[PDB]
Design a binder for this molecule. Structure first.
Ligand SMILES: C[C@H](CCC(=O)O)[C@H]1CC[C@H]2[C@@H]3CC[C@@H]4C[C@H](O)CC[C@]4(C)[C@H]3C[C@H](O)[C@]12C
Ligand SMILES: O=S(=O)(O)c1cccc2cccc(Nc3ccccc3)c12
Ligand code: NA
Length: 159
């Protein structure tokens, strides 16, 4: 069945620039700006569009070794990005897929708001524990702050 989790978090970076950096150049930026969170990102198949498969590896000592994600949808106009965790880490005999949706919305002070939905597709009924979802939020949060700091510090990057 599906468990749906939503959250919002704010960013000090405008929506277009954050979308270009955080989403469209995430494979490059995450290993560089947050090495203690994501050790590498390998493009397995595809050009960044729908269907593209990537392998996200975590640093030594993390609960999981890696996950493989698949790009579902990329909407440059509304700054929407949908992707699914399809293999590895928690994927297995109790969790079939995590389907996530990120939308980034402009705020009038020059910042942005990121609205995130995670949908955990389980086999049988194995419930998603508060820490399966809470670990996920912290990680997303850590990556966003690390990209934010880099973009503040590198004003000519991603304009
Ligand atoms: C934001 C990028 C998309 C851009 C890119 O691939 O460069 C995506 C692609 C894979 C994503 C990671 C996959 C596994 C995790 C799923 C969790 O529910 C949130 C934290 C993690 C660690 C995700 C954080 C972030 O959502 C990533 C890194
Ligand atoms: O919210 S953040 O940390 O900002 C976040 C930021 C950027 C990308 C994210 C991708 C997936 C999940 C997140 N958090 C999340 C939210 C609810 C449940 C599980 C994970 C992401
Ligand atoms: Na839950």
């Amino acid at each position: 069945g599906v468990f749906n989790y939503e959250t919002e978090t704010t960013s000090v970076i405008p929506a277009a620039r954050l979308f270009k950096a955080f989403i469209l150049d995430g494979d490059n930026l995450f290993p560089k700006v947050a090495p203690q969170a994501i050790s590498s990102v390998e493009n397995i198949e595809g050009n960044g569009g729908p269907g593209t498969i990537k392998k996200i590896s975590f640093p030594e000592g993390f609960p999981f070794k890696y996950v493989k994600d698949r790009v579902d949808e990329v909407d440059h106009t509304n700054f929407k990005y949908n992707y699914s965790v399809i293999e590895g880490g928690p994927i297995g005999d109790t969790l079939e897929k995590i389907s996530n949706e990120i939308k980034i919305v402009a705020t009038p002070d020059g910042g942005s708001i990121l609205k995130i939905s995670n949908k955990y597709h389980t086999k049988g009924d194995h419930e998603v524990k508060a820490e399966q979802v809470k670990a996920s939020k912290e990680m997303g949060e850590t990556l966003l702050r690390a990209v934010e700091s880099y973009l503040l510090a590198h004003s000519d990057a991603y304009n």
